[PDB]
Design a protein around this ligand. Structure first.
Ligand SMILES: CCCCCCCCCC(=O)OC[C@H]1O[C@H](O[C@H]2O[C@H](CO)[C@@H](O)[C@H](O)[C@H]2O)[C@H](O)[C@@H](O)[C@@H]1O
Ligand SMILES: CCCCCCCCCC(=O)OC[C@H]1O[C@H](O[C@H]2O[C@H](CO)[C@@H](O)[C@H](O)[C@H]2O)[C@H](O)[C@@H](O)[C@@H]1O
Length: 756
């Protein structure tokens, strides 16, 4: 089957290049418009109680808008706010921008709009020393995304109010900055990573145009994937976080997927096979591996569709779309271009890259001239001594494999320890580095006049009869709520608790629905209190609902842990069963799934140490805080899909030598030493693109990027060099065992192509 495609792609090589390069280029312009039609919501359980309790709450009583924007105004010259000239100056400016932007701003409400009012909450908007005061600026827009796009329209004119001296904080200022980091490290990754992945590409090839093709494939893959996600946006919403993931993961491993097609072809040319035959021996040894690599990542990501969060559901689409397209790009495009370039792929060399003024550029001259001087000596000689070093290192391991596996085994287990302190939370201003201008304003806002920031649990009552709800009917539900201790009462009066939620001027006050809300005492108790509140029995007609941001996160935190074992099971069994089909062996997938579970578990214990306890918060500039619930579900699906893939690389060369007649140590040594340079490049290529996104201002992007760079490092070193050879030799001849029915399944399914 795979041999059939290798021979048809050479007979049909000109038409497959034209068809595939056109589609990846067509998605380029289409992917450019994607950056505009993208939704930010999706962190809550799309279909759940706490979620649908906010739908009814925002519908009947009205979507709250007093937290869209808050603006702290301070008069200059140490003038106090009672200065009438200052009040008239700012109020005219505030009325003007509101007058200028009708389709964006709904208005501005605050103490300045009525300087002499008796409503003490509005009166408490000023400060004590009369040095500052703030306002609320509600914004238009029906959905969450429309409101932000409106704020981004009015942000410039709103900051020049009071002559610059105005502090903008609130929900929409934060959302503008958080979604703004997506494009920042996107540029950082294109200024500092695509050159470095290029210098790693010819680090492993000794040829320029050979190195260009994985970058060409890598660049082609994201251009097609970004085109797919903009098409997907027409049906169901896509998240802002999808665009970095395609670059962080899809781009890097698309180069890796192509980094294997060029090298195996050069190895086949190095043996002495002609152009027609070289594409055949590469597809069944690299293309069959690249196909199984991506399908494994697919099988390592579809169990996230079990999770309810639309945030994760959008990501798995991009991960599926990027790696499967990159794999199809690897076989269909990269193999056909090597028949067109033919044996003259290794022609240009470094000296030809020196043609255009890459030397006039500071960085590339140093990189070019080094490869030229090393071309006559260092680049070709060091490869054999490193190939020999890779072979010598493994026999130092296999000489006393227990001496290397046992210290490695105990260390990785000792790193899973901090995972027991995994605190989970939600998005807040803390997701930004504490030196941030917006975060400090929101923090100074909260420190100036406490009591406006509230995360209250809501009780949503709804009858289906349609009759209005009596005050005695409300009194019964309000009576039951007083049994669950732990809700606030600064009034110290039990009647003053669980007030009626404010009603907006935009909600059909269907009297079948009435909602009351009160603020918790300890957010940690939410998981327990919402359980207690949901445990209360409903009224003669109505059905209760527990909502608010605590119930929203605590349900999303909960919704992860339920589907997680079913995810872990589906993930483990589908990755393991796909590795057996690839290797033909059975115990290697069972062994790899251990090492994969050994790698994934150790990495999240480091992340928990440095991100929840803050061992590194002082250096990388962030603040230790409870992690995001869908994030740990994501990073589980990623590390597994990566650890599995790099083990697919190291072992697929051993099944080649084993099924070629060689001994087990021959199979291991052939596997590790012939790849010891390839995987290290693929590791560095990702460690480059991952290193870019690690400097992100968004702490959760730091989390995903560190978890990549950490586990990717362990897969390239401790597992590839040490643990795999140590554990494999203890198996000996057992490494390749397989029941015949299990084999014949692989063999007659068109995939039992064991060796060449
Ligand atoms: C089907 C899902 C519907 C869930 C209900 C959402 C409708 C509006 C709810 C509420 O009025 O405000 C929503 C919360 O917004 C912030 O939380 C985050 O919002 C998005 C993700 O949804 C995120 O991108 C943003 O950066 C966060 O600010 C507030 O923090 C919450 O307090 C609000 O409840
Ligand atoms: C790879 C497969 C591994 C599967 C392992 C599944 C283990 C499930 C563990 C359990 O479900 O979680 C226990 C509780 O953890 C949290 O409790 C704290 O979390 C935060 C912050 O500390 C907070 O929301 C909560 O109040 C804390 O007690 C969850 O929040 C709880 O819901 C879990 O029950």
């Amino acid at each position: 089957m795979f041999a059939w495609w290798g021979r048809t792609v050479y007979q049909f090589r000109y038409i497959v290049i034209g068809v595939m390069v056109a589609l990846c280029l067509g998605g380029g312009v289409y992917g450019i418009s994607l950056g505009n039609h993208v939704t930010q919501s999706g962190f809550y359980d799309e279909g759940s109680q706490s979620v649908a309790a906010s739908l009814i709450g925002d519908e009947v009583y009205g979507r709250d808008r007093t937290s869209h924007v808050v603006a702290i105004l301070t008069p200059p010259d140490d003038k106090k706010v009672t200065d009438k000239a200052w009040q008239k100056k700012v109020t005219e400016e505030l009325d003007q921008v509101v007058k200028d932007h009708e389709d964006q701003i709904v208005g501005w409400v605050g103490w300045l709009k009525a300087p002499d009012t008796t409503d003490p909450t509005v009166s408490a908007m000023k400060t004590q020393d009369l040095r500052h005061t703030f306002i609320s600026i509600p914004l238009q827009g029906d959905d969450d995304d429309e409101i932000l796009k409106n704020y981004q329209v009015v942000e410039p004119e709103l900051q020049q109010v009071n002559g610059g001296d105005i502090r903008l904080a609130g929900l929409n200022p934060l959302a503008s900055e958080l979604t703004g980091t997506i494009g920042e490290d996107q540029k950082r990754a294109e200024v500092a990573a695509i050159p470095l992945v290029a210098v790693v590409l010819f680090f492993v090839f000794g040829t320029v145009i050979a190195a260009a093709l994985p970058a060409i494939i890598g660049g082609l893959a994201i251009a097609g994937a970004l085109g797919i996600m903009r098409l997907v946006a027409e049906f169901t919403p896509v998240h802002f976080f999808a665009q970095p993931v395609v670059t962080l993961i899809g781009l890097g491993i698309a180069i890796d997927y192509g980094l294997f097609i060029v090298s195996r072809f050069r190895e086949e040319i190095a043996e002495g096979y002609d152009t027609e035959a070289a594409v055949r021996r590469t597809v069944m040894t690299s293309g069959r591996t690249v196909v199984f690599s991506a399908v494994i990542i697919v099988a390592s990501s579809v169990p996230l569709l079990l999770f309810p969060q639309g945030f994760l559901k959008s990501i798995t689409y991009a991960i599926i779309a990027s790696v499967m397209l990159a794999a199809i790009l690897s076989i269909t495009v990269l193999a056909a271009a090597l028949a067109i370039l033919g044996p003259r792929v290794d022609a240009l060399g470094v000296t030809t890259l020196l043609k255009i003024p890459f030397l006039a550029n500071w960085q590339f001259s140093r990189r070019i001239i080094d490869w030229f001087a090393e071309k006559t000596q260092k680049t070709k000689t060091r490869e054999e001594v490193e190939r020999g070093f890779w072979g010598r290192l493994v026999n130092v391991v296999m000489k006393r494999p227990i001496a290397f596996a046992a210290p490695i085994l105990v260390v990785m287990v000792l790193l899973i320890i901090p995972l027991g302190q995994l605190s989970l939370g939600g998005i807040s201003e803390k997701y930004l580095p504490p030196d941030n201008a917006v975060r400090q304003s929101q923090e100074q806002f909260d420190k100036l006049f406490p009591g406006f920031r509230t995360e209250p649990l809501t009780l949503v009552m709804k009858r289906e009869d349609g009759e209005p709800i009596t005050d005695a009917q409300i009194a019964d539900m309000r009576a039951k709520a007083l049994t669950v201790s732990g809700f606030t009462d600064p009034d110290n009066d039990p009647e003053k608790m669980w007030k009626e939620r404010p009603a907006n001027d935009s909600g059909s006050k269907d009297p079948s629905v009435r909602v009351i809300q009160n603020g918790l005492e300890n957010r940690n108790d939410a998981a327990k209190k919402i359980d207690e509140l949901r445990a209360l029995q409903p009224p003669h007609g109505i059905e209760v609902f527990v909502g608010g941001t605590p119930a929203l996160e605590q349900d999303s935190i909960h919704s992860l842990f339920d589907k997680l074992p079913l995810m872990a099971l589906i993930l483990i069994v589908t990755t393991t069963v796909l590795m057996f089909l690839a290797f033909g062996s059975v115990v290697l997938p069972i062994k790899a799934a251990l090492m994969s579970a050994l790698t994934l578990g150790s990495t999240m214990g480091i992340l928990t140490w440095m991100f929840v306890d803050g061992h590194g918060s002082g250096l990388m500039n962030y603040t230790p805080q409870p992690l995001m619930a869908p994030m740990i579900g994501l990073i589980i699906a990623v590390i597994w899909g990566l650890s599995t893939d790099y083990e697919v690389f190291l072992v697929s060369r051993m099944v080649e030598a084993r099924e070629r007649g060689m001994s087990t140590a021959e199979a291991i040594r052939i596997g590790t030493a012939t790849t010891g340079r390839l995987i290290t490049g693929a590791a560095l290529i990702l460690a480059v693109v991952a290193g870019a996104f690690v400097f992100s201002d968004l702490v959760m992007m730091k989390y995903l990027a560190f978890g990549l760079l950490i586990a990717l490092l362990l897969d390239a070193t401790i597992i590839r060099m040490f643990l795999v050879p140590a554990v494999m030799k203890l198996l000996g001849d057992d490494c390749w065992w397989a029941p015949r029915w299990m084999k014949r399944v692989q063999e007659k399914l068109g995939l039992g192509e064991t060796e060449l």
